[PDB]
Amino acid sequence: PERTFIMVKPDGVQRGLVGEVIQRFERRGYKLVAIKMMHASEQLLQTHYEALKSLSFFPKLVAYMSSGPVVPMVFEGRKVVENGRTMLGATKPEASCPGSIRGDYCQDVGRNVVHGSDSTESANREINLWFSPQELCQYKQAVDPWIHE
Amino acid sequence: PERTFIMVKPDGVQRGLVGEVIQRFERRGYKLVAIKMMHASEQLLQTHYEALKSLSFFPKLVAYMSSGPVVPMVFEGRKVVENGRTMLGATKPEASCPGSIRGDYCQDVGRNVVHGSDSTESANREINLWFSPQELCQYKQAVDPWIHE
């Protein structure tokens, strides 16, 4: 069961885009299995972005990502990691195509509304960092026979 | 700070309407301050519906509301309880007007997608039943000066 970690950033919350992000995944048949709103601590954010810890903008990113609530969530379905990346669009909004989240809503790489896992290994790490196993819900989608072979 | 308790029911999750419900409140300027997905236990559901415990359909409602995950959430803003009720529409979908959630999406009172508090006192009780105070996030909406006097 492929899963990906999606997270609305503080600017996505402020601009009222939480439902929009969820709905883009639901409309593609993906199964919401976990979600919550929280203030993320600096330590959690530093671990989440550990691959970037050596970059100049790391402290600014961490301080920004803790400056208002975020909405982490988990979606499940076929090719959800790769399709999640396409649906979010390029990291830099000016490189993203219309129809993607960042192409429709963003103008600045530093205010690009949403985070999504870039690989299966990253998804598994991020899911387990933000959610305990008991927060992940299991159910069978009624439309399952019509969304994949 | 007025708050209301909104909850997507198992049929709203199955039919991919979670983001739609959130977005109707965000588009009206209301502030999302708490959300999670969970399997609700029978005991929690019986307390939530305690006013109905003497009615014939009570056990069926409780069993149904525990048959798949739900998405409880909390919104904050001026007249959010009363406006929440109008936005959801009448309990019986056939009595609800188009433009409301149940008027747009529902055909059966027993599958009417979403729950919302019917009064301020009910909202405070339900919020505290489903969420500990630490799950409620506080922030200032940037659009605050433009959504109310």
Ligand SMILES: Nc1ncnc2c1ncn2[C@@H]1O[C@H](COP(=O)(O)OP(=O)(O)O)[C@@H](O)[C@H]1O
């Ligand atoms: N040059 C930059 N200046 C400011 N913020 C940046 C810059 N590059 C990346 N960021 C922020 O840090 C995050 C790092 O994520 P990354 O894995 O590089 O790409 P993506 O967010 O598309 O997965 C970005 O989403 C963005 O918000």
Ligand SMILES: Nc1ncnc2c1ncn2[C@@H]1O[C@H](COP(=O)(O)OP(=O)(O)O)[C@@H](O)[C@H]1O
């Ligand atoms: N006659 C009925 N048959 C089956 N289910 C019902 C019936 N009446 C109410 N319910 C269910 O129980 C819930 C009780 O909520 P109630 O406070 O009566 O109205 P509302 O849901 O509009 O606040 C309804 O939302 C509905 O899902």
